[PDB]
Design a protein around this nucleic acid. Structure first.
Ligand SMILES: [Mg+2]
Ligand SMILES: [Mg+2]
Ligand SMILES: [Mg+2]
Ligand SMILES: [Mg+2]
Ligand SMILES: [Mg+2]
Ligand SMILES: [Mg+2]
Ligand SMILES: [Mg+2]
Ligand SMILES: [Mg+2]
Ligand SMILES: [Mg+2]
Ligand SMILES: [Mg+2]
Ligand SMILES: [Mg+2]
Ligand SMILES: [Mg+2]
Ligand SMILES: [Mg+2]
Ligand SMILES: [Mg+2]
Ligand SMILES: [Mg+2]
Ligand SMILES: [Mg+2]
Ligand SMILES: [Mg+2]
Ligand SMILES: [Mg+2]
Ligand SMILES: [Mg+2]
Ligand SMILES: [Mg+2]
Ligand SMILES: [Mg+2]
Ligand SMILES: [Mg+2]
Ligand SMILES: [Mg+2]
Ligand SMILES: [Mg+2]
Ligand SMILES: [Mg+2]
Ligand SMILES: [Mg+2]
Ligand SMILES: [Mg+2]
Ligand SMILES: [Mg+2]
Ligand SMILES: [Zn+2]
Lengths: 146, 52, 81, 50, 88
RNA sequence: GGACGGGGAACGAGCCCCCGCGCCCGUACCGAGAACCGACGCAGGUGCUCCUGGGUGAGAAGCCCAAGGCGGCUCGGGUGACCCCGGGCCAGGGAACUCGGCAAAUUGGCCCCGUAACUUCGGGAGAAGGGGUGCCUGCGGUCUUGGGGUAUACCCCCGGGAC
RNA sequence: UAGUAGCAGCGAAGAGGGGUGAGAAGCCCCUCCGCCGGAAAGGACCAGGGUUUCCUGGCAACUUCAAUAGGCCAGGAGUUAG
RNA sequence: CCGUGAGGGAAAGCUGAAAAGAACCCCGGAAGGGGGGUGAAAAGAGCCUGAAACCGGGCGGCUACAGUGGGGCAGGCCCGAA
RNA sequence: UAGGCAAAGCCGCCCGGUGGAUGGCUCGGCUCGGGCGCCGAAGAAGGGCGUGGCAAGCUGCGAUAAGCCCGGGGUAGCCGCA
């Protein structure tokens, strides 16, 4: 009978990881049942070596460096990384929620809100800082927007 | 492709099964009669004078 | 209807551990017929009947008896043990 | 096949039952004249047309 | 319980491994060590037993790149068999 | 399943508790570079039919490594001639080879600049052509995701993520 | 012919020690080395095959070499459903 | 047994009167070998007789300066019991 | 000069291994002559499956399964091929 098959089934690991001590080579031939394999496992002549997990210290170090901004230059890019459509969705949602909050709180007349909304949809503003700077410079609100 | 490569497609299909009346591997499952004894299409046994 | 008893290692373990008898019966016998036959012939109460058809073409039945009758005791009584 | 019909299963059971060489006592009884059986076969070599 | 009857230190040169096919260099090195020990201890190549550290040293860089030389200790036992160990 | 109608009894549930019955057939294993077909323990075909972790990466690509499995595409050793099959390099010349640039070689990703004749006005187009590309130390920006601040957007602080 | 061809090519492969055994490079165990890892390779499973499954024992024949190994041979067993 | 199927389809007889089927001893891992037995005869279960092709050994002739097979004549070596 | 004297190889005989001819044998075939001549819903022929203590095939039989009952013949052996 194959001892390693029963041992792997008992221990719930791979047969590749089941290890049989050479001191039980005599007792292997007398192994008949899974109870016998359990007895050998209890004695400690049969055990499961630990599985290998890929170490992540190198990855964590490289991830810290990438967060700081290394190893992402022109010579390290092979395909598209920035999503234009997702960027447009986020840009519209940021500007629209800001303008709608201003109109809801009453700082902007609905007509001025309409003009700003159409300019945002028409891509007049690069970013929220540009939108705020335009609002402050053209004085579309009674108090300045931070 | 008509030889050995096409021979590999004869591994899962079937034209005939065992006939209940004559016991040969000659019952056509799609035509629903036996190609040997004619069961399912003729109540009389199929046997021709040109066959020894 | 009963052809014989199965006295293999699996059948003996099932008899000692689960109160089950293993019999070889006619291939056309149903679970109802097997249960009634067991009850009539041996005067025990049948809890349930599991049936299968072996690869050699025979019907084998695992008859689990009620909780007042011993499968091992019945086997010893018939002397097929 | 995993899913079988009973008639095909019974024919396979008949082939399984018949597939066996003659017993040694039969060989001794016939004085080494009956050694083989026509129903002896190997599953990989000779195929039943079940 | 096996007693040592002789002990020597040897430096076995394995430069011949670079003259054979790259797909068998470590196994060829094992054969070279066995032949060297048999020649220098006057025994048959099957009476020589390689040690585990020596085997791992020979196989440390996989089948293609065995080390160029090994410093070993050879011991002749009272039954006539010989043991070879990597010196350490 | 519901609704809309007709008929009947004095009982009575789609709610709660409790009782009883559920027959027959399949069920092992392979599921394929050895369990199927191909005369074979066959580099083919059927079935890669459906599913699959980490790094790099545009990627279900390749390369390396998990989980898991394998060393059984079922000969081993020595030698290091020629010759053959497959692969690497080769000064100066650069198609003079040859039916013929066959074969091989060149180019190659991404970003920026730039892009002709012609055209069915859509295209041609990655036309062509040029430049950049590693690692390290810092400074920023655009968002995202939670929590805390008067605080639902903005603003400040804190933790994570992307570019 | 001839103890000759083939047992290469299709991107993996073996080594050390021990045990068993008449007999071991090859079977069993440990250690080292390697290959796959969206797969000629890990999980599931259809048709088809039909006992090849599991256990025990074995090597007259089979496996492109060997064998104490085996999908092989002999004996025994195994498939449970509202 | 072959073909999906209609269909197609082999090879393969003989111990001895009687198992009297080979006791027993030595060797071999085993198939088995030697010795020793049974039988009128091994006719030994691979079983009446047992041809030739083929292969092994013994014997006779030749055999490395001489081009092959068949016939006639002369000779050398060998057999020449019936 | 030739013999002692021989490589590989060639021819002939003998013995052995292989092979299964030959001869002998025959419960088989073939031809011819004579007879006899329908079975099935009272479920036939044919097929599948099963059936023996050890039983794989053939033969027989059919869950009463190499088989059960009755009568006649046949007497002492019998449990088919085996
Ligand atoms: Mg890099
Ligand atoms: Mg767009
Ligand atoms: Mg065609
Ligand atoms: Mg069809
Ligand atoms: Mg069932
Ligand atoms: Mg096949
Ligand atoms: Mg299963
Ligand atoms: Mg193969
Ligand atoms: Mg990949
Ligand atoms: Mg693993
Ligand atoms: Mg190998
Ligand atoms: Mg070789
Ligand atoms: Mg050059
Ligand atoms: Mg020219
Ligand atoms: Mg020229
Ligand atoms: Mg070209
Ligand atoms: Mg050779
Ligand atoms: Mg060769
Ligand atoms: Mg690789
Ligand atoms: Mg790898
Ligand atoms: Mg797979
Ligand atoms: Mg197996
Ligand atoms: Mg086994
Ligand atoms: Mg078998
Ligand atoms: Mg003879
Ligand atoms: Mg005379
Ligand atoms: Mg000679
Ligand atoms: Mg009939
Ligand atoms: Zn038919």
């Amino acid at each position: 009978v194959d001892v390693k098959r029963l041992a792997a089934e008992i221990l719930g690991v791979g047969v590749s990881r089941v290890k049989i001590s050479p001191e039980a080579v005599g007792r292997l031939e007398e192994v008949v049942t899974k109870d016998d394999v359990r007895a050998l496992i209890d004695e400690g002549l049969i055990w499961a070596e630990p599985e290998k997990g890929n170490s992540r210290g190198r990855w964590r170090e490289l991830h810290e460096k990438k967060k700081k901004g290394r190893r992402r230059g022109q010579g390290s890019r092979k395909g598209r990384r920035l999503d234009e459509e997702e960027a447009w969705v986020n840009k519209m949602r940021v500007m629209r929620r800001f303008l709608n909050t201003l109109k809801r709180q009453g700082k902007l007349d609905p007509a001025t809100w309409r003009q700003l909304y159409r300019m945002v949809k028409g891509n007049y503003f690069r970013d929220l800082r540009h939108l705020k700077t335009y609002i402050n410079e053209h004085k579309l609100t009674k108090e300045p927007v931070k | 492709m008509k030889g050995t490569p096409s021979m590999g497609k004869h591994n899962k299909g079937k034209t005939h099964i065992r006939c209940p009346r004559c016991g040969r591997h000659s019952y056509n499952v799609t035509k629903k009669y036996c190609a040997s004894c004619g069961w399912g299409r003729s109540k009389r046994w199929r046997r021709y004078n040109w066959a020894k | 209807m009963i052809k014989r008893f199965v006295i293999t290692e699996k059948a003996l373990r099932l008899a000692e551990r689960e109160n089950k008898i293993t019999i070889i019966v006619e291939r056309t016998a149903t679970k109802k017929q097997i249960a009634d036959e067991v009850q009539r012939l041996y005067n025990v109460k049948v809890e349930k009947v599991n049936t299968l058809i072996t690869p050699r073409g025979e019907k084998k039945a695992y008859v689990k008896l009620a909780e007042g009758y011993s499968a091992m005791d019945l086997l010893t009584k018939l002397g097929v043990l | 096949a995993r899913n079988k019909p009973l008639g095909k299963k019974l024919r396979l059971a008949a082939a399984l039952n018949s597939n066996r060489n003659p017993p040694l006592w039969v060989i001794a009884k016939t004085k080494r004249r009956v050694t083989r059986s026509p129903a002896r076969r190997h599953w990989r070599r000779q195929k039943l047309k079940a | 319980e096996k007693k040592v009857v002789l002990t020597r230190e040897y430096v076995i040169n394995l430069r011949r491994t670079r003259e054979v096919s790259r797909t068998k260099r470590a196994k060829y090195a094992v054969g070279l060590i066995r032949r060297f020990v048999a020649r220098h201890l006057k025994v048959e190549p099957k009476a020589v037993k390689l040690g585990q550290a020596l085997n791992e040293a020979l196989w440390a860089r996989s089948i293609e790149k065995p080390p160029r030389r090994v410093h070993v200790v050879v011991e002749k036992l009272d039954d006539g068999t010989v043991r070879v160990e990597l010196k350490q």
